[PDB]
Amino acid sequence: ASAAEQVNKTIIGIDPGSGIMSLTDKAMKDYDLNDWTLISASSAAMTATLKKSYDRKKPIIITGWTPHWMFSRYKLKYLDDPKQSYGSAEEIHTITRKGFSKEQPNAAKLLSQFKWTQDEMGEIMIKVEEGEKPAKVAAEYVNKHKDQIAEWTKGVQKVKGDKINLAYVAWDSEIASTNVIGKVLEDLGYEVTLTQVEAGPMWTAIATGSADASLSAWLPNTHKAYAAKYKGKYDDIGTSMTGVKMGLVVPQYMKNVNSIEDLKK
Ligand SMILES: C[As+](C)(C)CC(=O)[O-]
Numbered sequence: 001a002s003a004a005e006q007v008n009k010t011i012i013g014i015d016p017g018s019g020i021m022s023l024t025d026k027a028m029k030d031y032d033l034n035d036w037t038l039i040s041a042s043s044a045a046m047t048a049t050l051k052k053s054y055d056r057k058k059p060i061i062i063t064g065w066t067p068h069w070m071f072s073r074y075k076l077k078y079l080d081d082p083k084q085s086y087g088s089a090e091e092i093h094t095i096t097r098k099g100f101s102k103e104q105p106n107a108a109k110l111l112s113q114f115k116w117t118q119d120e121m122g123e124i125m126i127k128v129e130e131g132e133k134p135a136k137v138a139a140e141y142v143n144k145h146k147d148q149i150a151e152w153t154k155g156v157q158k159v160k161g162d163k164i165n166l167a168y169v170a171w172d173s174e175i176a177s178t179n180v181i182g183k184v185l186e187d188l189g190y191e192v193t194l195t196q197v198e199a200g201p202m203w204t205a206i207a208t209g210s211a212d213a214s215l216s217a218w219l220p221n222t223h224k225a226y227a228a229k230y231k232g233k234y235d236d237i238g239t240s241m242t243g244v245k246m247g248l249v250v251p252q253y254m255k256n257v258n259s260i261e262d263l264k265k
Contacts, residue, residue, distance in 0.1 A: 002262075013041055014041055014042055019224070030083050032264065053251075069122060075252040079263075093240070096212055106159065114240050118243075121177065141183070166185075167213070203234075218244070
């Protein structure tokens with residue numbers, strides 16, 4: 001039976017303002033999936049549905065990305081994207097309000113040097129998903145990764161309670177990044193605020209300056225329209241991760257579903 005029959009031509013998505021959802025809308029146009037439906041939801045509802053479907057070995061298609069804990073807990077695959085609708089060579093960037101590195105060159109320089117791998121981010125995501133509190137897990141991380149933190153803080157000095165406001169979107173990945181770097185800041189002496197906001201407001205907050213920095217930029221593909229819209233109005237000072245991926249994801253037990261093209265059948 002055909003992917004469209006298996007899932008009733010429905011794809012499970014996340015928050016409507018995210019670029020993955022925008023990129024999935026493009027792919028549906030690109031591959032002529034014109035009678036298909038994309039359900040808007042959220043990160044937590046998407047994985048709850050995946051879990052419910054997977055536990056019953058029922059077919060599902062989700063808007064998925066890596067780094068994500070769901071790939072270590074379940075056997076998943078990306079559908080081949082021959083048209084490259086989701087693009088290529090995606091990274092995760094560290095952005096700030098414009099001229100933030102002129103005010104607090106010490107904080108900027110740290111953010112600039114923050115980087116890490118998928119497996120590493122995953123250590124945090126797994127525990128957070130298991131119900132542990134992200135500040136607590138972030139503490140465990142920074143102790144356990146002594147050699148790494150040192151790399152981040154090469155040339156970085158303590159402080160006297162200097163305020164820094166980190167905006168972030170509650171994707172599982174960005175929860176981890178923000179909390180980890182959150183900790184490394186609070187140890188350096190900063191008074192740290194974390195402001196949760198949705199995807200567009202996150203960018204609007206950096207570009208207007210209602211927040212200082214964010215670890216939540218996925219570039220150049222995922223957040224292309226937000227970057228374009230606010231070109232000139234923020235600084236891009238870091239790449240925390242490369243090789244990251246986004247697209248349509250299915251459980252491996254859907255053996256006959258392997259490409260977005262299979263959804264046309
Ligand atoms: C690939 As994610 C859900 C971490 C970022 C976005 O805007 O879609």
